[PDB]
Amino acid sequence: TQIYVSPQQDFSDLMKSWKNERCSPELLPYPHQLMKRLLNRISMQSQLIENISMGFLDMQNASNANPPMPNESKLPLLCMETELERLKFVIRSYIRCRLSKIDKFSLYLRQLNEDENSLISLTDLLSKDEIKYHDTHSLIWLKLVNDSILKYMPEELQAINDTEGSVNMIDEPDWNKFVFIHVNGPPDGKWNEDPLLQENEFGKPCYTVTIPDLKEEVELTIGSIYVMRYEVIRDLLRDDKVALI
């Protein structure tokens, strides 16, 4: 993101990102600017609600005066506070899901990070607190498992990052998991300037994808829910072209 059309657009983007993250079998990058805007918005909203509450409380407790009129007083404040609660819940759920996924794939991510050839780096995919979480958790878990079992283990296989022998200890994400998708089409209102979509009989613009293993071609028209594997649909997901349900 570079600019906001409206905060409601930011809310919609956050909800779509949460829905995509919840069902995806792979850890996705981090939209820093969206939450950078959202946290600041929450800060101003909390500050203003506290200021107005203090104002009415001081007005009511300075003297008898006039009690606040029930009309147009309770309902707005109730609406703001409940909306803030719902937004906080959504953010909390998204963050907890990301934390669970980072807990699952700790060793694989750490192995990927030290590779110089990988164009993807840990800085882009994670927030700084998540990096500190991964580092501390990996260190403490390694110390625990070393103090418990590995100290009596032979040196030749004391390493827990072994990828040789019979079975590997690295847990790669399953890219072939089946997911439910809804073909959203191009995000633009024109929805017809994309250079990838094609046409069939009776119009019905479609997106054509191929399965390398099965040697097939599958048409994906706009407005139909499909059940397709995840490996062949990463690009369309990352281009906001299709939305997982």
Binding site: P70, K74, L77, L78
Partner: protein, 549 residues
Amino acid sequence: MYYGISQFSEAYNKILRNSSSHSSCQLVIFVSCLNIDALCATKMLSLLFKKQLVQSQIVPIFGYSELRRHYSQLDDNINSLLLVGFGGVIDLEAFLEIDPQEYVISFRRDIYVLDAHRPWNLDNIFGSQIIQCFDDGTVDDTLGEQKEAYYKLLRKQRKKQIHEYEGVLEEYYSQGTTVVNSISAQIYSLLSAIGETNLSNLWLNILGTTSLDIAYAQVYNRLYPLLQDEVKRLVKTPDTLTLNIQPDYYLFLLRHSSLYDSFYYSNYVNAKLSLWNENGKKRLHKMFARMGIPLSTAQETWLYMDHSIKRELGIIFDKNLDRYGLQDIIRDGFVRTLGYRGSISASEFVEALTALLEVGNSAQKLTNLRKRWVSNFWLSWDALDDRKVELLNRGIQLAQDLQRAIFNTGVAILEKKLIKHLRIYRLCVLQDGPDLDLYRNPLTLLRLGNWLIECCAESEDKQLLPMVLASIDENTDTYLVAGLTPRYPRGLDTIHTKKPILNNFSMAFQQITAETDAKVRIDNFESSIIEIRREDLSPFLEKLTLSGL
């Protein structure tokens, strides 16, 4: 009066101006536990205050010690407090050491006491501004003379006025405790004046009114036409709700038990036909044979009972009851039906509620009993809503069991002739027997006493004497003594109903305890129920015999 009939709404408005807030609890309600009318009023108030989203808390209490302790616990933040079901007969300020100068600013707090007992503390109204109550229309007309003396009492020949005022105050006092109006009725009058009446409110008002049928039939008969007119003013779709005026009878769970048991356990039928000996059963069998219902047919559930006889039961009763003289059993009652669930009557519902209150789920054991009672009250409260029926079928079966136990104990009492006839008041003591642990509940004891007093009244004796009933709780080694008022036969005219029979037992007990160092504990909201020691019962008794009642 402080708050007349026409002022309720105004007072209600004040509550909002002192309680309607965003994130502050500024309203607490204390309820007289072990009372149906208080429960109905509390339910109606809870619905009202849930409508306008006014935050509140409901706290059951049992004794005056609990009331004092809970009031001492409260913080100054609570602007409004409600006291439903008690507080009329005593001066709260003296009890609660309330300083008006401490709460001047005026109107630092507000305590609304809502009670139905007719003799009430005159100083509580004419002296205090902090305490305020809802009059039923009594101060305006009845107390037109007492207020003058109180105002005057608030050159050597002027002592005549002081003597006259003292005499007037004494004459006003020394009166028995009675009940003349309903809390649910007052609350529904407020609701009708405001404009928030509906079927749930009407049902709760009907329950609150019909809860008094056993003891205050005069009040019930005075109030019934208003309910009838209000119900008149207000395809079997699975969401229908019907309130009708159907004929009903003084019968025990007619629509949930067999007709034979319904006739067998009915208190009025028992009193009129003496079912505790064999001649009563012979007369009952004669009744059944002459009506023409087979003995095997009459011993079946009301659901599977024959449709034709269920239809013609009214005519059968009309033609057969005259000879036996039970023509006072037929009356008019309210029936509520919701979809395909079935039919429930007000009497059956209130008996189920009472029994569920009775049964459900030294000082330490007394506290445990009192907390069990408040838990039973909460369970009964939860049973009110229409979404629960396993909490009502259980109550109905428990009512059947409790009535069986009461009948089994009363027949033994009447066999043993334990009712000693003294010169002033009758006396009976349940020294020993079976299932005596059930009678630790004051409401169960009152039920037993009501049956006993009905049986005594339905006799040829021409003496109206108060009855004293006592029990035993061997764990505590204490007697639970309750005073009972005499009752006229239900089939009597209104000319000999100039004033209901008063109760002087509270006055007698308080005078004896204040003049003699007896080891009693008078803390129940019912001033005629006390706990006395096993060794202290007798001397006390002779004292009560020798004291002016």
